[PDB]
RNA sequence: AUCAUUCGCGAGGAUGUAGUACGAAUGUCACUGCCAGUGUCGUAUCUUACGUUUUGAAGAACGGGCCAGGGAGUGUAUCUU
RNA sequence: UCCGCUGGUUCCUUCCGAAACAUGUCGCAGCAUGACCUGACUUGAGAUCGUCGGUGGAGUAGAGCACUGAUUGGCGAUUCCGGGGUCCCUCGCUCGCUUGUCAAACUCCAAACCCCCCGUCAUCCUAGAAAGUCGGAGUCCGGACUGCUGGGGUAAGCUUGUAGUCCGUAAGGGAGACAACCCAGCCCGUGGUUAAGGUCCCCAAGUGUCGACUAAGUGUUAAUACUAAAGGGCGUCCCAAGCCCCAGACAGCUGGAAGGUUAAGCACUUCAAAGAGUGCAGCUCACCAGUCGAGGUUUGGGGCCCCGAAAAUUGACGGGGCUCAAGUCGACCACCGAUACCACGGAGUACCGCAAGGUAAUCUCGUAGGAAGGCGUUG
RNA sequence: CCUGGGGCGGGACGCCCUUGAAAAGAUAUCAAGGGCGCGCAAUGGUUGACUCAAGCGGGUCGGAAACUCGCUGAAGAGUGC
RNA sequence: GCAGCUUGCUACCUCGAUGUCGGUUCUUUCCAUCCUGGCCGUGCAGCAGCGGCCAAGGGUGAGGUUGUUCGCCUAUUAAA
């Protein structure tokens, strides 16, 4: 039978190309965000603390409050509000 | 100015579609809406092109649907008098010419429906299985749906 | 009240052009008629019949 | 087992054979014939396949031992390059009890091929057109597709 | 409708006659003594009964020969709204 | 007695109206919890079923060998690890250049849908958005059509999924009948016009128009559980291209196949006109001369039809029948034809208004079920 | 108990990963590949110093089998399963 | 490819029952024809075969074993 496991199905979310596998940029890992800052969740696979559900990967999530290094985002899963803590390296800002 | 009007029913329809034709005020069939030319209203009328018909009326074709086809609120027919008493123009005609030419409106007139529920079309239409390009009458008539607007007087 | 038209239609999975020589009452009747005898002949609609030209002969 | 069972392309291709057990192997034995040296052959001619189909490598093998026969009665047995493109790289399994755990064993192998995709491309010279030609339409006919007869290489050569 | 003009290979279309004559209904004046309804029969269109089990019932699935009467969410205690 | 199992459970109208799915369960004919439906209340300003633009997620179709594994030859070297008849030299793997194929557990690439967020338009919304609390359930046998080459399977009106829409719970109109196929979602009566589909009769409206095809009663069968293939046709109708062609071909009619060779044909110096040879040693074609005097032959791509094509009560284009059609193809015209659409008059409902009354394209179908209002018997 | 009727077989009866699965999420079958019911006072933590697999070249019977020096080497190794 | 006449697969109908094999009796149907009728080919001399096409009007039986279907065996027979 399937597993459920948290890495479950997660061969391509959780995958680096090809030219960015090993380190990643550092300037990623000390990027601040502000209150209510709409951030967008893009997992970083090599970083393996403080990552979100492979679920999550993909989703908006407004910043509302900081526990150390990590931030706490108010991500949308299908109708439902989460509370989804993740490190500035998995995180990155949306441009307008 | 896309005439939109509707020519199938609201049976085996998906939701995306039928609440695209519900944003576009257009609930059963032979009912017409007239919308602005802007980039919005073109990805509207193009997500449910298998079940309306649209294209760009002329002023004459807009002025005879006010004419014969325009109702306000309480299900009262419009006519010259209330278009003089809540316009500035001579008639349902300039009113029409006024809105073709991009410096009117159909919220102008105080009350008024945006849904014309038109007659169906005198001597049938062309068939609701094909597309305008394939023979039907679906789709996109271009300055063509004057045509159609004209039987559906 | 003759004419010659030109082009090329879709004949299975190709396109083969073609000069049938049509008589007819005027152009858009030959036209018509080239139409009318691909569609017969050959079982294929008007998209996929092309017409080049319609010369009087 | 007649071809019409594994014929039909409906299925995802099962070709990872390190995730299945003991397949066996195409009867397929060469896919060169001829002359596998010389280059300048003017006329050359394609057999395509003209549906979405599933050959058996028996039924390749079957078409090219007609075609190559035929070729090498007709044109020598140096007269003539014929190719095999298609390699079969599907497994073809049957359910050898009920429905009840119905993953067949593998039963042999196969090649999908697309409409319009060659299995035979011939060489020969300008003379040994027609035999190679009417050869091809031999090899055909122990497929289990509709197949039509293109020319490559030297289509003013022979019209 | 008819008629006139023009177009169209043709079947036909457009224009005018004409939004005319007509047109559900709403009023009024004559005219008449039947009409609504009931029973049965015929003609035209539509419908393969009822309840139930059913994804699906006219079922070759289950119940009823017919008629009359009897025949199925009631009380105590306790909790909740 | 008990039973999760069977059957039955008695009046009318109005409003709204599902689920046959997930997790746990000695659970699989049951139940609980959640989704879905319903009623009320609190709350007080936004919500996103839809479009367009942008910041992001892509790793599916497709494509390809750049990784993991397969896979086909040719060419030139691994002087080395190896197989064979002074390790004299044979020589398969291995590595490069050029070819030929692939992947559901492969990807240098890579869409269209789609998903989160932002802006805009659009619609809903103070006649109450999103949120919250409580009352009441039903429900966990589902099924079908259109897609995903969905998975499995030889296939199945098979089994098991997913997206949408249907039947269940869906009338009326039409397909001959048709649970779910098309129009259509439907309060009552009248008038009109159309939708689907049809107009030779059965049957209201075309023995309709134009241009061709079919000679088989083929066909007169949108979807489909209701419709036979591979293969072939000098059947017939077309498009295109080679070849010979009024310096005279093609198919028929006149002189010859005479030098040769018996290399026992059938196990040349040089002539326009005769071979190591097509045929029942004379008996016969390929081939040059003349002849009527103009098209002939080969190939490829198409339309329809034909053979392939055999089943059991007499029978099914719905039946009659139909042949420049009443069949097929490319177009066209006019008409018929719904409870749809329009209009008129009427009923009910929803919300608002003190009330008169106002609005409704944005109200009127309905199974399990919730809510409301009434009729009736006995006292 | 599940079960293409039940039984025999099997456990798809608890946990984990890839595909199925149709590029958000979810998604079944006795669907396919399978694995786990442990091992380790170091096979753990941290700091420092280095870089691995495999080839080519040089080095003495230390052979084409050891150990050592140079070059290629973003990983072709190792990280308990 | 056809048939659905063997065995399978499936679970759509029937468990408030559609009396379940074989034989016997009687009637009918299909042709993919065993004989009878008509042809074609032959490596058809005749006789007798072999293969194929048309054809369903008629015929296609009696017995030993076995419950049998099927199958074997016996002697007839145009064929059984
Ligand atoms: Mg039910
Ligand atoms: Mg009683
Ligand atoms: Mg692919
Ligand atoms: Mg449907
Ligand atoms: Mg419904
Ligand atoms: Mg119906
Ligand atoms: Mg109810
Ligand atoms: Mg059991």
Not at chain 2, 14 to 36: A, G, W
Not at chain 4, 107 to 125: D, H, L, S
Request: aromatic fraction near 8%.
């Amino acid at each position: 039978t399937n597993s459920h496991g948290e890495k479950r199905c997660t061969r391509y979310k959780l995958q680096k190309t090809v030219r960015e596998r090993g380190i990643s940029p550092v300037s990623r890992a000390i990027q601040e965000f502000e209150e209510g800052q709409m951030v967008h969740i893009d997992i970083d696979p090599s970083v393996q603390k403080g990552m979100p559900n492979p679920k999550f990967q993909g989703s908006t999530g407004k910043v509302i409050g900081q526990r150390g290094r990590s931030y706490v985002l108010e991500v949308r899963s299908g109708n439902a509000m989460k509370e989804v803590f993740s490190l500035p390296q998995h995180l990155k800002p949306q441009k307008y | 100015m896309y005439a939109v009007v509707r020519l199938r029913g609201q049976v085996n329809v998906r939701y995306t579609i039928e609440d695209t034709m519900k944003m576009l005020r257009l609930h059963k069939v032979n009912h017409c809406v007239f919308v602005p030319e802007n980039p919005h209203y073109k990805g509207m009328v193009q997500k449910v092109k298998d079940y309306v018909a649209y294209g760009k009326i002329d002023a004459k074709t807009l002025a005879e649907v006010l004419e014969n086809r325009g109702r306000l609120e309480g299900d009262t027919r419009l006519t010259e008098e209330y278009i003089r008493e809540n316009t500035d123009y001579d008639s349902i005609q300039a009113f029409a010419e006024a809105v073709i030419e991009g410096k009117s409106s159909l919220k102008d007139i105080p009350k008024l429906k945006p849904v014309f529920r038109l007659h169906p079309p005198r001597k049938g239409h062309a068939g609701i299985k094909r597309t305008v390009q394939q023979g039907g009458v679906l789709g996109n008539h271009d300055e063509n749906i004057n045509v159609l607007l004209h039987k559906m007087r | 009240k003759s004419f010659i038209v030109k082009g090329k239609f879709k004949a299975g999975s190709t396109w083969e052009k073609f000069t049938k020589k049509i008589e007819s009452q005027n152009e858009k009747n030959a036209t018509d008629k080239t139409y009318s005898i691909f569609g017969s002949k050959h079982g294929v609609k008007r998209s996929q019949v092309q017409i080049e030209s319609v010369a009087e002969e | 087992k007649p071809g019409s069972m594994y014929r039909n392309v409906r299925q995802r291709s099962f070709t990872r054979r390190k995730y299945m057990g003991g397949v066996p192997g195409s009867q397929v034995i060469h896919y060169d014939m001829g002359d596998k040296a010389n280059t300048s052959f003017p006329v050359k001619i394609s057999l395509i396949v003209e549906e979405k189909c599933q050959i058996r490598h028996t039924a390749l093998e079957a078409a090219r031992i007609t075609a190559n026969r035929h070729l090498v009665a007709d044109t020598g047995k140096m007269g003539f390059y014929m190719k095999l493109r298609v390699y079969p790289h599907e497994v073809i399994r049957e359910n050898k009890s009920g429905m009840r755990r119905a993953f067949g064993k593998n039963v042999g192998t196969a090649a999908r091929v697309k409409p319009m995709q060659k299995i035979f491309t011939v060489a020969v010279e300008k003379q040994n057109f027609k035999a190679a030609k009417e050869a091809l339409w031999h090899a055909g006919q122990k497929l289990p597709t509709p197949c039509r007869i293109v020319v490559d290489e030297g289509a003013e050569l022979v019209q």
